[PDB]
Design a protein around this ligand. Sequence first.
Ligand SMILES: [Mg+2]
Ligand SMILES: [Mg+2]
Ligand SMILES: [Mg+2]
Ligand SMILES: [Mg+2]
Lengths: 112, 70, 53, 143, 96, 106, 123, 145
Amino acid sequence: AIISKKRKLVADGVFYAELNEFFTRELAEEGYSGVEVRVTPTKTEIIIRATKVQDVVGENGRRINELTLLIEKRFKYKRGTIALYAERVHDRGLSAVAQAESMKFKLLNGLA
Amino acid sequence: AKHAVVLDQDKFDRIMKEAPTYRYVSVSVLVDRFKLGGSLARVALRHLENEGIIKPVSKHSKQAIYTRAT
Amino acid sequence: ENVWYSHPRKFGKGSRQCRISGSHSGLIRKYGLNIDRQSFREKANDIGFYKYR
Amino acid sequence: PGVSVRDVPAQDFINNYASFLQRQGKLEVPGYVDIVKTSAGNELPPQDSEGWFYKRAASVARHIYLRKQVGVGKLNKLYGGAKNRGVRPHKHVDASGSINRKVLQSLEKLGVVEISPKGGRRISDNGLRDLDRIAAATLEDEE
Amino acid sequence: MLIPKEDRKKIYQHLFQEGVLVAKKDFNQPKHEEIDTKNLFVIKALQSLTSKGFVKTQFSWQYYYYTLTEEGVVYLREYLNLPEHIFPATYLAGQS
Amino acid sequence: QEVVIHKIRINLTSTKVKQLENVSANIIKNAETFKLVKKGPVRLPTKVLKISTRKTPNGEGSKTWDTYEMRIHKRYIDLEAPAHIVKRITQITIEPGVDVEVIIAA
Amino acid sequence: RKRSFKTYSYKGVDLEKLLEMPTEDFVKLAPARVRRKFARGLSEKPAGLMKKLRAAKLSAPENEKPAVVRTHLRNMIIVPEMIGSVVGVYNGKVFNQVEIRPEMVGHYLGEFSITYTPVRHGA
Amino acid sequence: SLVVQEQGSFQHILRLLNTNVDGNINVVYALTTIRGVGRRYANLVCKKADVDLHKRAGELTQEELERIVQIMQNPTHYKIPAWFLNRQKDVNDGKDYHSLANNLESKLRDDLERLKKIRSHRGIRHFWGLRVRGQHTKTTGRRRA
RNA sequence: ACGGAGCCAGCGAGUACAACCUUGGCCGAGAGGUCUGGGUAAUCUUGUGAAACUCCGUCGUGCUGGGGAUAGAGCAUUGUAAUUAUUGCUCUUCAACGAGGAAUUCCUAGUAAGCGCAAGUCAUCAGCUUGCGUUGAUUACGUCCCUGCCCUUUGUACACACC
Ligand SMILES: [Mg+2]
Ligand SMILES: [Mg+2]
Ligand SMILES: [Mg+2]
Ligand SMILES: [Mg+2]
């Protein structure tokens, strides 16, 4: 950075696709669905949609503040420019991935 | 080889006598009279446009057609 | 700890690893992906790459 | 009326320019004449051999007239072509590097070519005069 | 595992400031980012931790991810010293 | 008091078109309210990124291919306007996804 | 009698100079392949082997052969410093014995060993 | 340019360098017929003679042939850059040289011997009568010498 | 075919923590060096003035200047390392092959066929490949003759289903 426009946007898409697959593996218990990464000047809003939102947040900055620092150490960033917001899903049934991880758990746990 | 490549003064004279009053004149049609080879005919075509005698129709490289001066 | 544990692997197949699996076979380096085409093929829609024509 | 360079076709122009150069004989010699390939793919050197280079520099002159600022490589690339590379298929490679440079260096001393800014070479005052006269001379031969 | 113990103490210390660690899956690497040790030795150390309680481990995209649990925070305090009201990433520094 | 025009170029490059075109419409509408001399939303050629790939993992069966490609929409909104009015138009008119960016140096 | 047959050699003159011309003149007096190698960084190519070749010549019985200097580095070229000494060119299996002569001047060690056993049935 | 006037018939072959210079045709391509000369070398030689390449040159002057032959023998004396040659860089520390006739085929057979003496990966493959320059004959060319 | 001369594309792709594309100038027959730039790219490379083409000449239907394989030697370049030629270039070697039997592939329009470019893999290698543009026909515009498939009726001691 500065890099070419065509290489930055592919590295952004990668970055997102790395993050996406991390939060699939890391937030399995929380019932994660998908990320919505906004990149404005200074701050970047990494919004994460999940079912159990209280579990993603933890106890007022605990799991999200672990993960923000992890993202900084992966991709060289500083504190302040990255900011996590864990929101609820507008109707969980409509989202496929939420149901996928529910079906994942129901099988893992023990059910017909 | 099929011969008809050798250059001589006797062959030089026959070409000049075989020049005037000839409809088709080209590299092929000279060689069709068992004459001097392709280029030697092509050179012989070049001499026949020195001072008239045979006048041109086409001008192309290999497609070089000429006709007698009417 | 031992001295000679490294051939000069600046270039070629052995140097260029992928981001995901760690593979030296069918490696997309175009647009600096550094991804084995099979993981790319999985996540292509995530990385912005869509099938149009 | 108004006389111009383009009205004469490029084939007859370069021949008239070549003869014009042979009349002076002050275009200069490079030092590799007929000990030279011309294009890096070309099994046989120039067939005309003696002369030849006068047709070459005439060609570079008229190309530099038509274009804004032509250098060496762009001439090489233009004048290059197809390698009979073997049982493999053909490829494009740029023509001999130096010869085109010796064409340009010689044209600079005569006063055909002038050095241009940014990158390459353009046309002189006295270069444009000979171009137009040679154009006028070939038009008289057609008429 | 055969670690010069000074290098191990630096890794623990560096772990406790962050409360987090982003190690590569890159053995034969001469030195780690931030810490002045080989990457392999950091991974051996974070392998040694994961086994005896602690330390929540992932292995995605050639990057290991290690967060310290409640019992992980207790044992790192025991190794180093620092008694109470300290860094990690369990709570914020001030306002951020 | 200042009125010092630095000549600022705005860079809009993105995948999504209907966002980008709406973003580009929003900046020119702000320029119309603030009433500035500006060149309109210039539209540069779309750099299409073509990753050719065989569909298979194994390299067996028929030899099928997928052109996994990426659309890119490179745009420009050149301003003949001061530094302070650019600081305003950077603060507002920010949408998600589209890469807003400023050159600032003529 | 004066000249023994003809000079066993690289490009011109006789042997007497070959044996005392170290590397630098021998590089200048060679094909492009050897010059390019010397132009690039030399580290561990002439380090351990040449000392053994020099130690082999010093500790020899005189008239008879020196000790066989076994070589992984078959990529080395025959410089004239160690003509006469036998060398074991490594083919994966067997340090295969090659005799360095005054005619093997500026050729690789590898090209005098052959890894595969050549083909039979019909030549 | 000019058709052959005057009696003509000045010898069809024409021997040169213990080899057959073909009558009529051309100097360049009569030179190619000689064992050791090619098209680009022979065109280089014709420049030094100052004979027209358009002419057939089986009706050559004898002094012109003696120039040509001397140009074949001596590269360095005449204006030949000396890496336009058949052989270059050979024996101990000295000079480049080449041949173009019976002298060259003998020189090739001497260099083939030199290869056989050194027993190189090239020279070993010449003994077999096989494929020197690492070319695969798994499929291609099932007849051979 | 070989010389010159004319000389018109499109897809592309390309480095700042590296070593990318690399014009312009000098050296070198080349390959390729070197200084210097411009370019993180409708900006510079790049009109990528690519090839086949078009013009004027050389040879004329001879294993010929067609055809380039095999070879020898050198001169370059990549890389730590090139012999089991990495590739390029130089000169030399001039082999087979005068349109290919039985067979069978692909194809209905900017297509086929020709031509080259291009990225992909890549430090270095293009006969490869996914794209691209140039030149641009022939011949249907049908049929079930073959091949395959599909239904439908029929038969079936089959249902792991004609292995
Ligand atoms: Mg050809
Ligand atoms: Mg461009
Ligand atoms: Mg031949
Ligand atoms: Mg089928």
